[PDB]
RNA sequence: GGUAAGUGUACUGGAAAGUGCACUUGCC
């Protein structure tokens, strides 16, 4: 649809991956080949990219007949090519140590962006998936909104569900948005640029798919108090004295609104969901839609 | 109150944009 071919611009995101001189490199969607153009300029080991329309292998080749062996094209899917069997086990550094000499950069439609993000964040919590070899790094590319959410601070405008799911398991920086007039084809979108770190110590210590139940029922109202849409965790039975005592051993002030909860006052909840959950098996998978 | 355009707007973990709401106007 929508493709990225200015020079300028193409470097200057390669530019803030980081240093990738002989490091391992998978770009997903390579597309015509701008993105991957400019990754082949860094000089890097090589280059892995995996794209699922086969028309633009024919262009793609000619960058790799112009770097050989630099460049490796993949015919595949993103949502399901299992990039862990892709590069030595040698890359493989542990996870309190530096990030890896493995990283990732995307430029896909937000269509298949979005999701991934989501099946890659859990990634980071399993420490499976692009993350076996350990806290690799991530830039990647979303509608300037959703960029902005990804990062957005405890009290901003636009701090979101993803903010949390975003940032407690990573460093977060939203370094640039891009104006949709930058495109061939022009959308009516602007286009920002996330970088993602995977956090050493991550801000909260629970099975992933229980704080992405946490952090939903929180961002449920989202400007009402807190407790309005925390206590949809409970049956309506159990439902009052229940949220009392979530907020009571958590120790949040229920007057507080979703955007103002640090990323801590959500370790918080969800250490005492936890307990409340081992102490009542029956209730980690309540949802009011019954 | 029903529809179309416009303008605001809210929400979005379906965002290369979508939908919901409000108001005004035209027509019924
Ligand atoms: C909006 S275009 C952007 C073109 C190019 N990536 C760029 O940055 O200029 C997105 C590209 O991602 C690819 N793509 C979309 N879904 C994919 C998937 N599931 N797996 C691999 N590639 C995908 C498409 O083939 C297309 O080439």
């Given at each position: 649809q929508n493709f990225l071919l200015d020079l300028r611009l193409t470097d200057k995101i390669v530019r803030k991956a980081g240093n990738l001189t002989n490091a391992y490199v998978y770009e997903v969607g390579p597309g015509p080949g701008g993105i991957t153009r400019s990754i082949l300029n860094a000089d890097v080991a090589e280059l892995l990219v995996v794209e699922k329309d086969t028309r633009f292998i024919p262009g793609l080749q000619m960058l790799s007949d112009a770097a050989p062996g630099k460049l490796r094209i993949v015919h595949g899917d993103v949502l399901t090519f299992k990039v862990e069997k892709a590069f030595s086990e040698s890359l493989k550094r542990p996870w309190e140590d530096d990030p890896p000499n493995v990283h990732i950069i995307g430029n896909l439609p937000f269509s298949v962006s979005t999701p991934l993000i989501i099946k890659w964040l859990e990634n980071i919590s399993c420490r499976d998936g692009p993350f076996?070899?350990?806290?690799?790094?991530?830039?990647?590319?979303?509608?300037?909104?959703?960029?902005?959410?990804?990062?957005?601070?405890?009290?901003?405008?636009?701090?979101?569900?993803?903010?949390?799911?975003?940032?407690?398991?990573?460093?977060?920086?939203?370094?640039?948005?891009?104006?949709?007039?930058?495109?061939?084809?022009?959308?009516?979108?602007?286009?920002?640029?996330?970088?993602?770190?995977?956090?050493?110590?991550?801000?909260?210590?629970?099975?992933?798919?229980?704080?992405?139940?946490?952090?939903?029922?929180?961002?449920?109202?989202?400007?009402?108090?807190?407790?309005?849409?925390?206590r949809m965790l409970f049956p309506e039975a159990q439902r009052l004295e229940s949220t009392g005592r979530l907020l009571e051993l958590a120790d949040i002030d229920p007057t507080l609104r979703p955007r103002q909860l640090s990323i801590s006052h959500f370790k918080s909840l969800c250490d005492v969901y936890r307990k409340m959950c081992d102490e009542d098996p029956q209730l980690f998978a309540y949802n009011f839609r019954e």
């Amino acid at each position: 649809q929508n493709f990225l071919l200015d020079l300028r611009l193409t470097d200057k995101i390669v530019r803030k991956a980081g240093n990738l001189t002989n490091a391992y490199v998978y770009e997903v969607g390579p597309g015509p080949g701008g993105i991957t153009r400019s990754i082949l300029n860094a000089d890097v080991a090589e280059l892995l990219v995996v794209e699922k329309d086969t028309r633009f292998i024919p262009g793609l080749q000619m960058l790799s007949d112009a770097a050989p062996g630099k460049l490796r094209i993949v015919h595949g899917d993103v949502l399901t090519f299992k990039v862990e069997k892709a590069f030595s086990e040698s890359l493989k550094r542990p996870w309190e140590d530096d990030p890896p000499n493995v990283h990732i950069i995307g430029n896909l439609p937000f269509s298949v962006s979005t999701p991934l993000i989501i099946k890659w964040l859990e990634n980071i919590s399993c420490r499976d998936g692009p993350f076996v070899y350990g806290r690799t790094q991530m830039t990647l590319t979303f509608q300037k909104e959703v960029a902005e959410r990804l990062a957005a601070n405890t009290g901003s405008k636009q701090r979101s569900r993803l903010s949390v799911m975003a940032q407690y398991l990573c460093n977060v920086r939203h370094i640039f948005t891009i104006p949709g007039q930058a495109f061939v084809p022009k959308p009516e979108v602007d286009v920002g640029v996330v970088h993602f770190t995977p956090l050493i110590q991550p801000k909260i210590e629970q099975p992933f798919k229980l704080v992405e139940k946490v952090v939903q029922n929180v961002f449920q109202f989202r400007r009402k108090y807190c407790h309005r849409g925390l206590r949809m965790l409970f049956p309506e039975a159990q439902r009052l004295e229940s949220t009392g005592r979530l907020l009571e051993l958590a120790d949040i002030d229920p007057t507080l609104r979703p955007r103002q909860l640090s990323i801590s006052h959500f370790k918080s909840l969800c250490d005492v969901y936890r307990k409340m959950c081992d102490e009542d098996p029956q209730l980690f998978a309540y949802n009011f839609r019954e």
